[PDB]
Design a protein around this ligand. Structure first.
Ligand SMILES: [Mg+2]
Ligand SMILES: [Mg+2]
Ligand SMILES: [Mg+2]
Ligand SMILES: [Mg+2]
Ligand SMILES: [Mg+2]
Ligand SMILES: [Mg+2]
Ligand SMILES: [Mg+2]
Ligand SMILES: [Mg+2]
Ligand SMILES: [Mg+2]
Ligand SMILES: [Mg+2]
Ligand SMILES: [Mg+2]
Ligand SMILES: [Mg+2]
Ligand SMILES: [Mg+2]
Ligand SMILES: [Mg+2]
Ligand SMILES: [Mg+2]
Ligand SMILES: [Mg+2]
Ligand SMILES: [Mg+2]
Ligand SMILES: [Mg+2]
Ligand SMILES: [Mg+2]
Ligand SMILES: [Mg+2]
Ligand SMILES: [Mg+2]
Ligand SMILES: [Mg+2]
Ligand SMILES: [Mg+2]
Ligand SMILES: [Mg+2]
Lengths: 83, 208, 127, 100, 116, 99, 151
RNA sequence: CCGGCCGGGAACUCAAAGGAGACUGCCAGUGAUAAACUGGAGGAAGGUGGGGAUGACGUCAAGUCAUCAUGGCCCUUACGACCAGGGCUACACACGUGCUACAAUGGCGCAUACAAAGAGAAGCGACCUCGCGAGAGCAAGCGGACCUCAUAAAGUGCGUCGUAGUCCGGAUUGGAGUCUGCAACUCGACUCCAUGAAGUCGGAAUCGCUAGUAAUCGUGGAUCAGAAUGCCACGGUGAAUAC
């Protein structure tokens, strides 16, 4: 995990996107390629469709997704089984 | 991949290094980059001149180059002209006050760099390859050579299957470490592919 | 007035001083029993001593460095025999038949390329 | 290697030499423990706007005569093949074959 | 010789026999007896009756046998139902900590299944 | 005391420079402390000699570095300055010092 | 080897008794290079080994070694149809080195709490003609007399 | 100041330049007056002293057009070029090479002896100060036989656990962390704490090794921001056996 004297990591653009989302008040799906940004508690109650290498898959952030990262809900491989 | 390069196993024994300079581990690679480019442009410029052994000896913030050659008469040009016209583009690459001196090489038939360049320029102009081998094998023995071996390698005569052929006269030891083995290699760029030349010349055994 | 010896082993080298006295023993400023914890290593420094009659004639003073338990103990042995001869020149014939005046020059063989050790080649399998 | 892999390398040395004292300042604002989180929130969002090729841990060592990204040696700058060729001629002072 | 809602063995020593509790190891049991004031090489049998009393007041502050089996089962089932990467690996029997699953995944998958 | 180190890759050209640097101030000065040798770094290497796939076929190289020491205890007026104008051969960096 | 012969190298006597063969049972007992923790099981062997016997410390071992010395062994010539197991008179050194190998072998295989207690339940019985090292002398001497036909 | 640190001393070790020595040369004996071989007086070394490098003519249309170079052909708003995320880390499964184990010749705790070879400037980073710890803070010392990396471990002294899936084994997952790094979800190493799998020496078959070898136990280095059970290098302990 990232150090705690450094603090959390987030992109500067997605922080401006979610702020502009809540201040305007939309439920539009925000598509962002920031799987490496940690979710902030203002992002709760929004649809933020984080990319998985192939497309954009939506994430509606509930409470328990704060200290996680956005890539954990956008699966990047695909697998059904061998036979 | 069977034979060692005969120069490298002789470098501490009877043969010198071409670059005798000091550095630390800081600036060793920057000097080594510096030494490669100044030999690279001196090859392209003096490819009509008979330069054989460029020696980069750089003591105390200046570079010195002894050009070993069969003729200074094109390497100097006019007396003090091409020694100076090449120097100002030698002090461009290195970054030190350059000094391109000259030591002349007599007897051009006894040089493995020049025999590599006197066979390749005949292979370049479509001669019969087996004649061009035999001039070098016979000319060294008149000039007092204890042994020669030449070899052309790869797509001889134009035919589709490549091969390799060689000749030998006198004696050329290789396992004797104290053998005065002159040895170098050239590159023939013909219309059907690449031909390679190797030449061994033995003079004697430099006693210790 | 003193007598000196030199001995060597694998990576060991000892400095043996000899004075006449009680038969007093000092090994790196320390006693015979304090230094060598191993009884076999306590023995092998006394191997020329039981060979000849000099367990009481001479004192022996040791400063050994480098090597190991049996390394330094074989370094001290070859040096005492060098000093048994540095005194007498007569005991050389019994010490030669003991094999004590010969430095056993078995040095450690280096690791080589394509090998896991000095001689252990890796596990070959044809398929 | 490719000409577009040597030229891709050169600007990574150029861009990282330009923004050296500016990327190093934003680390010491976070390497300071005894500073304010009204500054340690300003350093951590500012370093994303600096380019990715500005980081000194982004550029990769290559052989200086061919551009090979493996077999590297730092004392020569070259890969394993080109040190060997220049040794056997003699342009590397001291470098000969060893045996012990 | 009965500590913390289980039975702890009789003829084992002080710090060893406490490690039968789901929730202590060799280190945390040294924290029990150095705080309480008992030597560490006596058994749990022939401890006096004024000694087993206070020893659980050292144990009760830790999150132990029933209090610790539930929060691990609450932790893993919380990873299940969000849809995170970790819980996908907890509901598919494939390991979580980054390890290679091309070969040597023989703990989370069980021993070898033949092809049928 | 005045220190003079010499680092050189050649093993006889540094022996060729010590009867060059003593013979500059032996005339002018006295109590030259002497040509003290130091141990030798043997900086070794290993590469691969095949271009594609032969891991066991290799060459072991090395570069050895030679060290000496020339120590002048007290200079005269004419000791270091005659030594100062001189310049030694290639493959050597000298390190003159005081302290 | 096909060509030539080497003899022997010197084997250092001990600090303890002044024997060549005391160094030769610790070398068969030594595993993984440890002469320190092997020469001390041998020293803690002979203490309880002379105690039950009532003999000298070294002389009690030399009698337990006697009842396990092989005298006829079968080697393989294998020039006929199958392998012929041909019985041979044994040289006096292989009488001793095979015996010490069998006493070290049994003491690995017991279930006591020490090594020296697994060992002293074997060198006690090897002078008392029961155990496992005497089962190996008599299973070699069972194969050596069922092959007495061949010469 | 009980510590070569410090008068001083050039002995000894050690360092590294030059000379010395080993040649079946002197001894008997076998053999064709030969070449040679067997045993030996000597000697630090005996008969190729020990290790390395050194790979003849050619074989396999052996390997690499992706280190590089190059005949030919093919591509040219794309088979070229720049970017962000993803992938090279996937897993019903199959084989090759390793590390750790299955314990008492051992585990833990405590005291305590003994090395060699190496690297170091955008580098290694004493002591002091905190922190359960990896680390952090302040910050000397060294371009280095000066300074640091650096504490060798197996061993020995004492003490315990006494044959159980165990005070053996350490996988695996839960919650906390530290660090390098724009950035540790995919997909890093390390710390502390909780959990404590399989495993009790392995069918047929198969491999390495002739002496400082095997076995064993540590240690360095190169690639490198970080990331070695791999690769290369080093010493300590140190066998069995060859009719
Ligand atoms: Mg070769
Ligand atoms: Mg030869
Ligand atoms: Mg080893
Ligand atoms: Mg391999
Ligand atoms: Mg197989
Ligand atoms: Mg190109
Ligand atoms: Mg990199
Ligand atoms: Mg427990
Ligand atoms: Mg003799
Ligand atoms: Mg002899
Ligand atoms: Mg083919
Ligand atoms: Mg192929
Ligand atoms: Mg290809
Ligand atoms: Mg990319
Ligand atoms: Mg891969
Ligand atoms: Mg299999
Ligand atoms: Mg354990
Ligand atoms: Mg124990
Ligand atoms: Mg502390
Ligand atoms: Mg089980
Ligand atoms: Mg643990
Ligand atoms: Mg058992
Ligand atoms: Mg490293
Ligand atoms: Mg690293």
């Amino acid at each position: 995990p990232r150090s705690l004297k450094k603090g959390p990591f987030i992109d500067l653009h997605l922080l401006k996107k979610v702020e502009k989302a809540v201040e305007s008040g939309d439920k539009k799906p925000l598509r962002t390629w920031s799987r490496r940004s940690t979710i902030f508690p203002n992002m709760i109650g929004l649809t933020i469709a984080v990319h998985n290498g192939r497309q954009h898959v939506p994430v509606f952030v509930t409470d328990e997704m704060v200290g996680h990262k956005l890539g954990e809900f956008a699966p990047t491989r695909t697998y059904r089984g061998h036979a | 991949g069977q034979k060692v390069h005969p120069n490298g196993i002789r470098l501490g024994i009877v043969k010198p290094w071409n670059s005798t300079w000091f550095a630390n581990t800081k600036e060793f690679a920057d000097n080594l980059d510096s030494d490669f480019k100044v030999r690279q442009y001196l090859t392209k410029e003096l490819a009509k001149a008979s330069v054989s052994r460029i020696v980069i000896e750089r003591p105390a913030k200046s570079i010195r180059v002894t050009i070993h050659t069969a003729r200074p008469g094109i390497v100097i040009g006019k007396k003090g002209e091409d020694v100076e016209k090449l120097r100002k583009v030698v002090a461009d690459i290195a970054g030190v006050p350059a000094q391109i001196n000259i030591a002349e090489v007599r007897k051009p038939e006894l040089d493995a760099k020049l025999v590599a360049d006197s066979i390749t320029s005949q292979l370049e102009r479509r001669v019969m390859f087996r004649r061009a081998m035999k001039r070098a094998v016979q000319n060294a023995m008149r000039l007092g050579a204890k042994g020669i071996k030449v070899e052309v390698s790869g797509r001889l005569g134009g035919a589709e299957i490549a091969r390799t052929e060689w000749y030998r006269e006198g004696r050329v030891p290789l396992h004797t470490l104290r053998a005065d083995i002159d040895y170098n290699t050239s590159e023939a760029h013909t219309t059907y592919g690449v031909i390679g030349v190797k030449v061994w010349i033995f003079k004697g055994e430099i006693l210790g | 007035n003193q007598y000196y010896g030199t001995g060597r082993r694998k990576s060991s080298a000892a400095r043996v001083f000899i004075k006449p006295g009680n038969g007093k023993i000092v090994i790196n400023q320390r006693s015979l029993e304090q230094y060598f914890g191993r009884e076999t290593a306590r023995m092998v420094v006394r191997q020329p001593l039981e060979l000849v009659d000099m367990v009481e004639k001479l004192d022996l003073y040791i400063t050994v460095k480098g090597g190991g338990i049996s390394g330094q103990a074989g370094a001290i042995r070859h040096g005492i025999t060098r000093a048994l001869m540095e005194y007498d020149e007569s005991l050389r014939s019994e010490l030669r038949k003991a094999g004590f005046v010969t430095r056993d020059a078995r040095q450690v063989e280096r690791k080589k390329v394509g090998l896991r050790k000095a001689r252990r080649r890796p596990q070959f399998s044809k398929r | 290697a490719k000409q577009s892999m040597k030229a891709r390398e050169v600007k990574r040395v150029a861009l990282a030499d330009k923004y050296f004292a500016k990327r190093a300042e934003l680390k010491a604002i976070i390497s300071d423990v005894n500073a304010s989180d009204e500054d340690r929130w300003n350093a951590v969002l500012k370093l994303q706007t600096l380019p990715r090729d500005s980081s000194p841990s982004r550029q990769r060592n290559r052989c200086r005569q061919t551009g090979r990204p493996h077999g590297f040696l730092r004392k020569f700058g070259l890969s394993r093949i080109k040190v060997r060729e220049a040794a056997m001629r003699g342009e590397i002072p001291g470098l000969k074959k060893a045996s012990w | 010789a009965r500590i913390a809602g289980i039975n702890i063995p009789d003829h084992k020593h002080a710090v060893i026999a406490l490690t039968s509790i789901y929730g202590v190891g060799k280190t945390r049991s040294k924290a029990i007896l150095a705080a309480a004031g008992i030597a560490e090489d006596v058994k749990i049998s022939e401890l006096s009756e004024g000694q087993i009393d206070t020893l659980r007041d050292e144990v009760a502050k830790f999150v132990v046998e029933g209090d610790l089996r539930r929060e691990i089962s609450m932790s893993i089932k919380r990873l299940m139902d969000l849809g995170c990467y970790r819980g996908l690996r907890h509901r598919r029997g494939l390991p979580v900590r980054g390890q290679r699953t091309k070969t040597n995944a023989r703990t989370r998958k069980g021993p070898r299944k033949p092809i049928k | 005391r005045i220190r003079i180190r010499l680092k050189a890759f050649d093993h006889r050209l540094i022996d060729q420079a010590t009867a060059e640097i003593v013979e500059t101030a032996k005339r002018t000065g006295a109590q030259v402390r002497g040509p003290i040798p130091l141990p030798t770094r043997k900086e070794r290497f290993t590469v691969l000699i095949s271009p594609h796939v032969n891991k066991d076929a290799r060459d072991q190289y090395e570069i050895r570095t030679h060290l000496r020491l020339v120590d002048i205890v007290e200079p005269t007026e004419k000791t270091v300055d005659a030594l100062m104008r001189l310049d030694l051969a290639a493959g050597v960096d000298v390190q003159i010092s005081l302290g | 080897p096909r060509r030539r012969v080497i003899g022997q190298r010197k084997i250092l006597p001990d600090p303890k008794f002044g024997s060549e063969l005391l160094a030769k049972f610790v070398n068969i007992l030594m595993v993984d290079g440890k002469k320190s923790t092997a020469e001390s099981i041998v020293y803690s062997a002979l203490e309880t080994l002379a105690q039950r016997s009532g003999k000298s410390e070294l002389e009690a071992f030399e009698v337990a070694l006697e009842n396990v010395r092989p005298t006829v062994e079968v080697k393989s010539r294998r020039v006929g149809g199958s392998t012929y197991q041909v019985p041979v008179e044994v040289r006096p050194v292989r009488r001793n080195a095979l015996a010490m190998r069998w006493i070290v072998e049994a003491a690995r295989k017991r279930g006591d709490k020490s090594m020296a207690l697994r060992l002293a339940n074997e060198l006690s019985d090897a002078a008392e003609n029961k155990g496992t090292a005497v089962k190996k002398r008599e299973d070699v001497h069972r194969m050596a007399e069922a092959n007495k036909a061949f010469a």
